């Protein structure tokens, strides 16, 4: 059947565009880090409160959407359609009108702001949920589904580095109106995610309608009913929250360590620009690595792998070589190898129902796939209490120690935070006595 695969080759256009698109705005934001003032409305705390409603209610309900109760047709394409266009509406708004910056926040700023928000979430759940669905062939699912990154691979490798010198010529103190121009750049290729997908992707639902109107639609609420999960989601969420913590302290604090190291450097040279172009190189090795055996073990190591550098850092404190130009460069080089940790993670939530659906045997789609990828992110908002624990008592031992070292000290705590949460990740996903043959062991079972 070409019908389901056309959902993904065009969806590959999604992947090369959507990621190319988040590549740009996000990267662009960085000189707006240079640009941030927002005289009347724009405090950090206030924007945060908008972020409060930004994520949470969006993805439970996103999943909750997809089958039309009163209309007899239901599929992802309009879901993902509701995303290609929900974002682009915004960015086109960012492009068009001339003296809108003069007006206060009350008015249009609201209207736009909603729409970009939605996309943030109506692209997380459509995309890495609609790729695994493609041609039915059982075991090779997991081996063909994180591969595609190959062309997405180029985009991030690139936004941070070479657009920047060319972007830094046109206009000064106009960044608001500046990306106004460059929007066309991004839109053209990403509008190219909305074109191809438009006349193409809506298919397997066509199939189903033709086929009896399908009580299968209700099946999607039965496989929430009969099993919300066999036991799949609730243990798997916990560890994921711990996952994202490391991303948000890498990406979030990535900028800031470059902003904030011991000494002065007029250069501002090799690191994080190269660290981006170093991180994703490991996407060629590890996604294709374990030639007979399972991605899982790859993964278990990998859950260690972002953990690991702290473990390395923790051990190398015992070494104590410089404590000055050492800490400026303290094992981020590991950063060459992180890459494909989220996708197998996002797969992990709806998989027992994924192969459980396989037992149902008829169709392909998902529910819980959203609830980890959205609760994951929030759970660092509990982390403000957690920081009182991180300093609190765990490390902390009878008072005296305060003077020796503070830069190696605060960095290690910043770096312990994901790690101390990370005890849900490996413990809960390794210790023997786990199960009989499971979605993981299906490909590993093919061995013997």
Short mmCIF file of C-alpha atoms in Angstrom, two decimals:
data_model
loop_
_atom_site.label_atom_id
_atom_site.label_comp_id
_atom_site.label_asym_id
_atom_site.label_seq_id
_atom_site.Cartn_x
_atom_site.Cartn_y
_atom_site.Cartn_z
CA UNK A 1 0.00 0.00 0.00
CA UNK A 2 1.49 3.37 -1.09
CA UNK A 3 -1.42 5.03 0.70
CA UNK A 4 0.09 5.09 4.25
CA UNK A 5 3.62 5.61 3.03
CA UNK A 6 2.65 8.76 1.17
CA UNK A 7 1.70 10.07 4.63
CA UNK A 8 5.39 9.77 5.58
CA UNK A 9 7.39 10.71 2.46
CA UNK A 10 5.50 14.03 2.42
CA UNK A 11 5.86 13.81 6.20
CA UNK A 12 9.58 13.60 5.51
CA UNK A 13 8.94 16.96 3.95
CA UNK A 14 7.44 17.80 7.32
CA UNK A 15 10.63 16.59 8.99
CA UNK A 16 13.00 18.46 6.72
CA UNK A 17 10.82 21.55 6.94
CA UNK A 18 9.32 21.50 10.44
CA UNK A 19 12.76 20.91 12.00
CA UNK A 20 14.39 23.35 9.52
CA UNK A 21 11.67 25.81 10.64
CA UNK A 22 12.13 25.39 14.43
CA UNK A 23 15.83 25.46 13.54
CA UNK A 24 15.56 29.08 12.38
CA UNK A 25 13.16 31.03 14.60
CA UNK A 26 14.72 29.35 17.59
CA UNK A 27 18.24 30.21 16.46
CA UNK A 28 17.08 33.73 15.44
CA UNK A 29 15.71 34.18 18.90
CA UNK A 30 19.41 34.12 20.07
CA UNK A 31 20.27 37.60 18.71
CA UNK A 32 16.95 38.66 20.15
CA UNK A 33 18.58 37.58 23.43
CA UNK A 34 20.85 40.51 22.49
CA UNK A 35 17.67 42.45 21.54
CA UNK A 36 15.32 41.82 24.52
CA UNK A 37 13.88 44.95 26.19
CA UNK A 38 10.07 45.12 25.77
CA UNK A 39 9.42 48.41 27.60
CA UNK A 40 5.73 48.08 28.58
CA UNK A 41 5.09 44.33 28.49
CA UNK A 42 7.84 41.69 28.54
CA UNK A 43 9.15 40.70 31.98
CA UNK A 44 10.62 37.18 32.20
CA UNK A 45 8.18 36.17 35.00
CA UNK A 46 5.13 37.47 33.14
CA UNK A 47 6.05 35.58 29.92
CA UNK A 48 6.52 32.51 32.12
CA UNK A 49 2.93 32.71 33.31
CA UNK A 50 1.92 32.58 29.62
CA UNK A 51 4.14 29.50 29.31
CA UNK A 52 2.11 28.13 32.21
CA UNK A 53 -0.86 27.61 29.89
CA UNK A 54 1.52 27.02 26.91
CA UNK A 55 2.02 23.27 27.23
CA UNK A 56 -0.16 21.29 29.64
CA UNK A 57 -3.87 21.21 28.67
CA UNK A 58 -2.75 21.26 24.94
CA UNK A 59 -1.51 17.69 24.48
CA UNK A 60 -4.00 15.64 26.52
CA UNK A 61 -6.62 17.38 24.40
CA UNK A 62 -4.56 17.17 21.17
CA UNK A 63 -4.77 13.34 21.38
CA UNK A 64 -8.35 13.63 22.47
CA UNK A 65 -9.13 15.36 19.23
CA UNK A 66 -8.52 13.26 16.27
CA UNK A 67 -11.63 11.14 15.41
CA UNK A 68 -14.59 13.40 14.36
CA UNK A 69 -17.62 12.46 16.46
CA UNK A 70 -20.30 14.07 14.33
CA UNK A 71 -18.42 14.11 11.03
CA UNK A 72 -17.75 10.63 9.63
CA UNK A 73 -14.07 11.23 8.75
CA UNK A 74 -11.00 11.21 11.02
CA UNK A 75 -7.23 11.39 10.54
CA UNK A 76 -3.80 12.94 11.35
CA UNK A 77 -3.44 14.83 8.05
CA UNK A 78 -5.83 17.66 9.19
CA UNK A 79 -4.21 17.30 12.62
CA UNK A 80 -0.81 17.93 11.07
CA UNK A 81 -2.52 20.32 8.76
CA UNK A 82 -3.87 22.14 11.75
CA UNK A 83 -0.11 22.47 12.54
CA UNK A 84 1.68 23.41 9.32
CA UNK A 85 -0.76 26.27 9.05
CA UNK A 86 -1.26 27.08 12.68
CA UNK A 87 2.39 28.06 13.03
CA UNK A 88 2.72 29.74 9.63
CA UNK A 89 -0.29 31.87 10.29
CA UNK A 90 1.81 33.38 13.11
CA UNK A 91 5.10 33.81 11.28
CA UNK A 92 3.21 35.40 8.35
CA UNK A 93 1.72 37.79 10.95
CA UNK A 94 5.26 38.47 12.14
CA UNK A 95 6.10 39.30 8.53
CA UNK A 96 3.27 41.46 7.16
CA UNK A 97 1.91 44.75 8.85
CA UNK A 98 4.03 47.91 9.10
CA UNK A 99 3.63 49.86 12.42
CA UNK A 100 2.15 47.27 14.80
CA UNK A 101 5.02 47.51 17.33
CA UNK A 102 3.66 50.93 18.36
CA UNK A 103 0.47 49.32 19.75
CA UNK A 104 0.39 47.90 23.29
CA UNK A 105 0.07 44.19 24.08
CA UNK A 106 -3.65 44.21 24.69
CA UNK A 107 -4.76 43.91 21.10
CA UNK A 108 -3.50 41.60 18.33
CA UNK A 109 -0.47 40.23 20.21
CA UNK A 110 -2.96 37.84 21.92
CA UNK A 111 -4.69 36.48 18.88
CA UNK A 112 -1.29 35.63 17.19
CA UNK A 113 0.29 34.26 20.32
CA UNK A 114 -2.34 31.53 20.81
CA UNK A 115 -1.87 30.08 17.38
CA UNK A 116 2.00 29.61 17.61
CA UNK A 117 1.49 27.98 20.99
CA UNK A 118 -0.88 25.38 19.52
CA UNK A 119 1.50 24.28 16.83
CA UNK A 120 4.23 23.75 19.50
CA UNK A 121 2.00 20.88 20.56
CA UNK A 122 0.12 19.92 17.34
CA UNK A 123 3.46 19.04 15.78
CA UNK A 124 5.03 17.10 18.66
CA UNK A 125 2.25 14.47 18.63
CA UNK A 126 1.40 14.26 14.97
CA UNK A 127 4.94 13.79 13.71
CA UNK A 128 6.82 11.07 15.55
CA UNK A 129 3.39 9.33 16.02
CA UNK A 130 2.49 9.17 12.25
CA UNK A 131 5.90 7.96 11.00
CA UNK A 132 5.90 4.54 12.77
CA UNK A 133 2.47 3.79 11.26
CA UNK A 134 3.67 3.40 7.69
CA UNK A 135 4.08 0.00 5.98
CA UNK A 136 2.94 -2.79 8.25
CA UNK A 137 6.12 -4.92 8.23
CA UNK A 138 6.48 -5.89 11.90
CA UNK A 139 10.00 -5.88 13.37
CA UNK A 140 11.84 -3.31 11.21
CA UNK A 141 9.53 -0.53 12.51
CA UNK A 142 12.07 0.55 15.07
CA UNK A 143 14.99 0.42 12.62
CA UNK A 144 13.43 2.60 9.87
CA UNK A 145 11.76 5.25 12.07
CA UNK A 146 14.66 7.24 13.67
CA UNK A 147 16.78 6.80 10.56
CA UNK A 148 15.09 9.56 8.53
CA UNK A 149 16.98 12.24 10.37
CA UNK A 150 19.49 12.14 7.51
CA UNK A 151 18.36 15.33 5.80
CA UNK A 152 17.01 16.96 8.99
CA UNK A 153 20.61 16.39 10.04
CA UNK A 154 21.83 19.22 7.80
CA UNK A 155 19.51 22.02 9.05
CA UNK A 156 20.62 22.47 12.68
CA UNK A 157 24.24 21.86 11.63
CA UNK A 158 23.88 25.08 9.71
CA UNK A 159 21.43 27.69 11.22
CA UNK A 160 23.79 28.59 14.11
CA UNK A 161 26.84 29.18 11.91
CA UNK A 162 26.60 30.59 8.30
CA UNK A 163 23.24 32.38 8.05
CA UNK A 164 24.42 34.46 11.01
CA UNK A 165 27.22 36.35 9.25
CA UNK A 166 24.93 37.04 6.29
CA UNK A 167 22.01 37.96 8.59
CA UNK A 168 24.24 40.52 10.42
CA UNK A 169 24.50 43.05 7.53
CA UNK A 170 21.04 44.26 6.50
CA UNK A 171 19.55 46.24 9.46
CA UNK A 172 20.27 47.49 13.01
CA UNK A 173 17.92 47.84 15.99
CA UNK A 174 15.05 46.43 13.89
CA UNK A 175 15.19 42.73 14.79
CA UNK A 176 11.42 42.82 15.21
CA UNK A 177 10.97 43.99 11.63
CA UNK A 178 14.20 42.19 10.70
CA UNK A 179 12.91 38.61 10.90
CA UNK A 180 9.93 40.20 9.23
CA UNK A 181 12.09 40.00 6.06
CA UNK A 182 13.70 36.55 6.73
CA UNK A 183 10.32 34.88 7.37
CA UNK A 184 10.04 34.54 3.59
CA UNK A 185 13.19 32.38 3.74
CA UNK A 186 11.70 29.93 6.13
CA UNK A 187 8.11 30.06 4.95
CA UNK A 188 9.05 29.14 1.39
CA UNK A 189 10.49 25.73 2.44
CA UNK A 190 8.11 25.17 5.35
CA UNK A 191 5.09 26.38 3.36
CA UNK A 192 6.60 23.56 1.36
CA UNK A 193 5.65 21.29 4.28
CA UNK A 194 2.02 22.51 4.00
CA UNK A 195 1.83 22.18 0.11
CA UNK A 196 3.04 18.63 -0.40
CA UNK A 197 1.11 17.43 2.60
CA UNK A 198 -2.16 19.19 1.55
CA UNK A 199 -3.26 17.09 -1.51
CA UNK A 200 -1.39 13.94 -0.29
CA UNK A 201 -1.46 12.68 3.31
CA UNK A 202 -5.19 12.07 4.08
CA UNK A 203 -5.60 8.41 3.12
CA UNK A 204 -5.83 5.53 5.62
CA UNK A 205 -8.95 7.23 6.98
CA UNK A 206 -10.38 7.11 3.42
CA UNK A 207 -9.64 3.40 3.54
CA UNK A 208 -11.49 2.96 6.85
CA UNK A 209 -14.60 4.94 5.92
CA UNK A 210 -15.03 2.87 2.81
CA UNK A 211 -14.65 -0.05 5.19
CA UNK A 212 -17.91 0.00 7.25
CA UNK A 213 -17.52 3.43 8.84
CA UNK A 214 -15.38 1.48 11.26
CA UNK A 215 -16.29 0.81 14.86
CA UNK A 216 -12.43 1.07 14.91
CA UNK A 217 -12.86 4.83 15.63
CA UNK A 218 -14.49 3.82 18.90
CA UNK A 219 -11.76 1.23 19.23
CA UNK A 220 -9.35 4.16 19.75
CA UNK A 221 -11.42 4.99 22.91
CA UNK A 222 -11.67 1.26 23.75
CA UNK A 223 -7.87 0.94 23.74
CA UNK A 224 -8.01 3.79 26.20
CA UNK A 225 -10.93 2.02 27.91
CA UNK A 226 -10.10 -1.67 27.99
CA UNK A 227 -6.51 -0.71 28.64
CA UNK A 228 -5.59 2.91 29.38
CA UNK A 229 -2.24 1.18 29.30
CA UNK A 230 -1.44 -2.41 30.25
CA UNK A 231 1.17 -0.72 32.45
CA UNK A 232 3.01 1.31 29.81
CA UNK A 233 2.69 5.07 30.39
CA UNK A 234 2.86 5.90 34.13
CA UNK A 235 6.31 4.38 34.89
CA UNK A 236 7.58 5.65 31.47
CA UNK A 237 6.50 9.25 32.17
CA UNK A 238 8.45 9.58 35.37
CA UNK A 239 11.80 8.88 33.73
CA UNK A 240 11.07 11.05 30.75
CA UNK A 241 10.52 14.22 32.88
CA UNK A 242 14.10 13.46 34.02
CA UNK A 243 15.10 13.24 30.38
CA UNK A 244 13.99 16.68 29.36
CA UNK A 245 15.64 18.21 32.38
CA UNK A 246 19.05 17.49 30.72
CA UNK A 247 17.95 19.05 27.39
CA UNK A 248 16.74 22.22 29.05
CA UNK A 249 19.92 22.57 31.06
CA UNK A 250 22.01 21.76 27.93
CA UNK A 251 20.09 23.96 25.45
CA UNK A 252 18.83 26.50 28.01
CA UNK A 253 22.08 26.79 29.98
CA UNK A 254 24.15 26.08 26.83
CA UNK A 255 24.03 29.76 25.85
CA UNK A 256 24.67 30.88 29.42
CA UNK A 257 27.87 28.90 30.14
CA UNK A 258 29.34 30.58 27.07
CA UNK A 259 28.02 33.82 28.51
CA UNK A 260 29.42 33.00 31.95
CA UNK A 261 32.78 31.19 32.39
CA UNK A 262 35.66 32.20 34.75
CA UNK A 263 37.64 34.59 32.50
CA UNK A 264 37.49 37.10 29.63
CA UNK A 265 37.88 36.08 25.94
CA UNK A 266 37.71 38.65 23.09
CA UNK A 267 37.59 35.74 20.63
CA UNK A 268 34.25 34.03 21.72
CA UNK A 269 35.42 30.98 19.66
CA UNK A 270 35.30 27.17 19.22
CA UNK A 271 32.63 25.74 21.56
CA UNK A 272 28.86 25.84 21.32
CA UNK A 273 28.65 26.72 17.63
CA UNK A 274 30.95 23.70 17.14
CA UNK A 275 29.09 21.81 19.91
CA UNK A 276 25.93 21.91 17.80
CA UNK A 277 27.96 20.74 14.84
CA UNK A 278 29.55 18.20 17.09
CA UNK A 279 26.33 16.87 18.85
CA UNK A 280 24.51 15.73 15.74
CA UNK A 281 27.38 13.98 14.07
CA UNK A 282 26.74 11.12 16.50
CA UNK A 283 23.40 10.77 14.78
CA UNK A 284 25.20 8.77 12.01
CA UNK A 285 26.89 6.27 14.26
CA UNK A 286 24.42 5.44 17.04
CA UNK A 287 21.12 5.26 15.11
CA UNK A 288 22.57 2.62 12.80
CA UNK A 289 25.07 1.09 15.23
CA UNK A 290 24.12 -2.30 16.73
CA UNK A 291 23.93 -4.36 13.62
CA UNK A 292 22.27 -7.55 14.74
CA UNK A 293 21.11 -6.58 18.29
CA UNK A 294 18.70 -4.08 19.84
CA UNK A 295 18.36 -0.30 19.87
CA UNK A 296 17.19 -0.82 23.45
CA UNK A 297 20.74 -1.63 24.74
CA UNK A 298 22.03 1.22 22.62
CA UNK A 299 19.37 3.17 24.56
CA UNK A 300 20.25 1.85 28.04
CA UNK A 301 23.82 2.93 27.48
CA UNK A 302 22.31 6.09 26.00
CA UNK A 303 20.21 6.78 29.04
CA UNK A 304 23.62 6.66 30.76
CA UNK A 305 25.19 8.71 28.04
CA UNK A 306 23.96 12.21 28.87
CA UNK A 307 24.12 11.08 32.58
CA UNK A 308 27.56 9.88 32.00
CA UNK A 309 29.50 13.08 31.53
CA UNK A 310 28.47 14.13 35.04
CA UNK A 311 29.60 10.69 36.20
CA UNK A 312 32.84 11.53 34.30
CA UNK A 313 32.84 15.05 35.78
CA UNK A 314 32.17 13.62 39.27
CA UNK A 315 35.15 11.26 38.91
CA UNK A 316 37.44 13.95 37.38
CA UNK A 317 36.88 16.19 40.40
CA UNK A 318 39.08 13.58 42.08
CA UNK A 319 41.77 14.49 39.47
CA UNK A 320 41.98 18.35 40.08
CA UNK A 321 44.32 19.50 37.25
CA UNK A 322 43.91 23.32 36.97
CA UNK A 323 40.59 24.47 38.43
CA UNK A 324 40.69 27.48 36.09
CA UNK A 325 41.15 26.79 32.34
CA UNK A 326 40.17 23.22 33.15
CA UNK A 327 36.63 24.14 34.17
CA UNK A 328 36.31 26.40 31.08
CA UNK A 329 36.60 23.15 29.13
CA UNK A 330 35.27 20.33 31.29
CA UNK A 331 34.17 17.34 29.19
CA UNK A 332 31.44 18.93 27.06
CA UNK A 333 33.34 17.20 24.26
CA UNK A 334 31.20 14.20 25.12
CA UNK A 335 28.52 16.57 23.69
CA UNK A 336 29.44 15.05 20.25
CA UNK A 337 27.15 12.15 21.16
CA UNK A 338 23.56 12.70 22.29
CA UNK A 339 21.36 12.89 19.20
CA UNK A 340 18.60 10.28 19.09
CA UNK A 341 17.40 9.97 22.61
CA UNK A 342 13.91 11.55 22.33
CA UNK A 343 12.45 9.63 19.45
CA UNK A 344 12.87 6.11 20.97
CA UNK A 345 11.62 7.76 24.15
CA UNK A 346 8.51 9.17 22.40
CA UNK A 347 7.95 5.72 20.82
CA UNK A 348 8.09 4.13 24.25
CA UNK A 349 4.69 5.43 25.54
CA UNK A 350 2.15 4.11 23.05
CA UNK A 351 4.20 0.99 22.14
CA UNK A 352 2.51 -1.62 24.37
CA UNK A 353 -0.70 -0.46 22.66
CA UNK A 354 1.29 -0.14 19.41
CA UNK A 355 2.00 -3.89 19.51
CA UNK A 356 -1.24 -4.29 21.43
CA UNK A 357 -2.99 -2.69 18.46
CA UNK A 358 -0.97 -5.16 16.45
CA UNK A 359 -2.81 -7.83 18.42
CA UNK A 360 -6.01 -5.96 17.59
CA UNK A 361 -4.47 -6.31 14.13
CA UNK A 362 -6.41 -3.84 12.00
CA UNK A 363 -5.25 -0.20 11.83
CA UNK A 364 -2.47 2.21 12.93
CA UNK A 365 -2.71 5.51 15.09
CA UNK A 366 -2.06 6.56 18.79
CA UNK A 367 -3.28 8.17 22.08
CA UNK A 368 -0.81 8.20 25.05
CA UNK A 369 2.12 9.17 22.77
CA UNK A 370 1.30 12.76 23.72
CA UNK A 371 1.17 12.53 27.55
CA UNK A 372 4.80 11.83 28.19
CA UNK A 373 6.14 14.41 25.66
CA UNK A 374 3.97 17.11 27.43
CA UNK A 375 4.07 16.14 31.07
CA UNK A 376 7.74 15.48 30.56
CA UNK A 377 8.43 19.10 30.02
CA UNK A 378 6.38 20.62 32.82
CA UNK A 379 8.00 18.55 35.56
CA UNK A 380 10.96 20.94 35.94
CA UNK A 381 8.50 23.42 37.45
CA UNK A 382 8.39 21.19 40.49
CA UNK A 383 12.20 21.47 40.32
CA UNK A 384 12.25 24.78 42.22
CA UNK A 385 11.54 22.71 45.39
CA UNK A 386 14.00 20.15 44.09
CA UNK A 387 16.85 22.74 44.10
CA UNK A 388 16.34 23.09 47.88
CA UNK A 389 16.93 19.31 48.02
CA UNK A 390 19.87 19.40 45.61
CA UNK A 391 21.77 21.83 47.83
CA UNK A 392 19.61 20.93 50.77
CA UNK A 393 20.98 17.81 52.40
CA UNK A 394 21.99 15.21 49.83
CA UNK A 395 25.40 16.64 48.90
CA UNK A 396 25.52 18.93 51.95
CA UNK A 397 27.40 17.64 55.01
CA UNK A 398 28.33 19.52 58.26
CA UNK A 399 28.78 23.16 57.39
CA UNK A 400 32.48 24.02 57.17
CA UNK A 401 33.17 23.71 53.46
CA UNK A 402 32.50 27.03 51.64
CA UNK A 403 35.74 28.73 50.52
CA UNK A 404 37.77 26.39 48.29
CA UNK A 405 35.81 26.32 45.03
CA UNK A 406 32.54 27.79 43.85
CA UNK A 407 32.66 27.71 40.01
CA UNK A 408 33.37 23.98 40.01
CA UNK A 409 30.82 23.79 42.82
CA UNK A 410 27.72 25.51 41.36
CA UNK A 411 28.29 23.96 37.91
CA UNK A 412 28.35 20.46 39.41
CA UNK A 413 25.04 21.14 41.17
CA UNK A 414 23.52 22.52 37.98
CA UNK A 415 24.76 19.28 36.43
CA UNK A 416 23.63 17.01 39.23
CA UNK A 417 19.98 18.22 38.96
CA UNK A 418 18.92 16.20 35.94
CA UNK A 419 21.10 13.34 37.30
CA UNK A 420 19.42 13.20 40.74
CA UNK A 421 16.04 12.97 38.98
CA UNK A 422 17.63 10.57 36.48
CA UNK A 423 17.42 7.76 39.06
CA UNK A 424 13.98 6.94 37.60
CA UNK A 425 15.46 6.45 34.11
CA UNK A 426 17.86 3.39 34.27
CA UNK A 427 16.76 1.74 37.58
CA UNK A 428 13.11 1.61 36.44
CA UNK A 429 14.12 0.63 32.86
CA UNK A 430 16.74 -2.07 33.58
CA UNK A 431 16.86 -4.35 36.71
CA UNK A 432 16.28 -7.98 35.73
CA UNK A 433 12.90 -9.67 36.25
CA UNK A 434 11.21 -7.14 33.96
CA UNK A 435 9.16 -9.25 31.54
CA UNK A 436 8.72 -12.01 29.01
CA UNK A 437 9.16 -11.11 25.31
CA UNK A 438 8.11 -7.47 24.90
CA UNK A 439 7.91 -4.91 22.07
CA UNK A 440 11.63 -4.44 22.72
CA UNK A 441 12.36 -8.20 22.60
CA UNK A 442 10.47 -8.62 19.28
CA UNK A 443 13.46 -7.37 17.26
CA UNK A 444 15.88 -8.85 19.82
CA UNK A 445 13.91 -12.12 19.62
CA UNK A 446 14.54 -12.27 15.87
CA UNK A 447 18.13 -13.05 16.87
CA UNK A 448 17.39 -16.34 18.67
#
